Amino acid sequence: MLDAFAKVVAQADARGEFLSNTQIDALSKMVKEGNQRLDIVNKVTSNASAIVTNSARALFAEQPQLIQPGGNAYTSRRMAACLRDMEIVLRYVSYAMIAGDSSVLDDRCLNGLRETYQALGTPGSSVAVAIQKMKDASVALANDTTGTPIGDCSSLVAELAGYFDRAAVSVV
């Protein structure tokens, strides 16, 4: 499990060489954002249950077959697992967002999820549609002021959406 700071060091040991000054002002800029990144993860972890429940409700108002009798979302049990599978991906997307690198997301969330969903008969495309609906609500909730200083956050919400798309293409 790496953060974005450990990435450049793990590529520096490999060549066996010191970080040159261009990598250093690439990193001091990363530090110099800093507060924006944690404002982003603060906004996602403050509203996590709302994100998950609204995305699941939109998913079943859209695809009623999962809650149809015989569906993969039928009954209390299957539904309880589906409710917080999405909350697992939201948790690991927030971990990867605070780390600056999608290393924890690939290690312990997306590693082997595809044949896990294949071995159960779970339709991975509907999981991907649920991931996309969580993504849309998270980027919508990320760029509001809500009592923060005005500025641009665009390079951070692009990375936040990229983590969601990385999770969405790896499941299916």
Partner: peptide
């Protein structure tokens, strides 16, 4: 997509291995 099974992403040992002693990963 994802790294091979078991390999912790970002700290492979074959990173800067020479070609004269590189081993193909099964």
């Amino acid at each position: 997509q994802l790294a091979p099974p078991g390999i912790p992403p970002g700290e492979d040992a074959r990173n800067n291995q020479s070609l004269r002693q590189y081993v193909a990963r099964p």
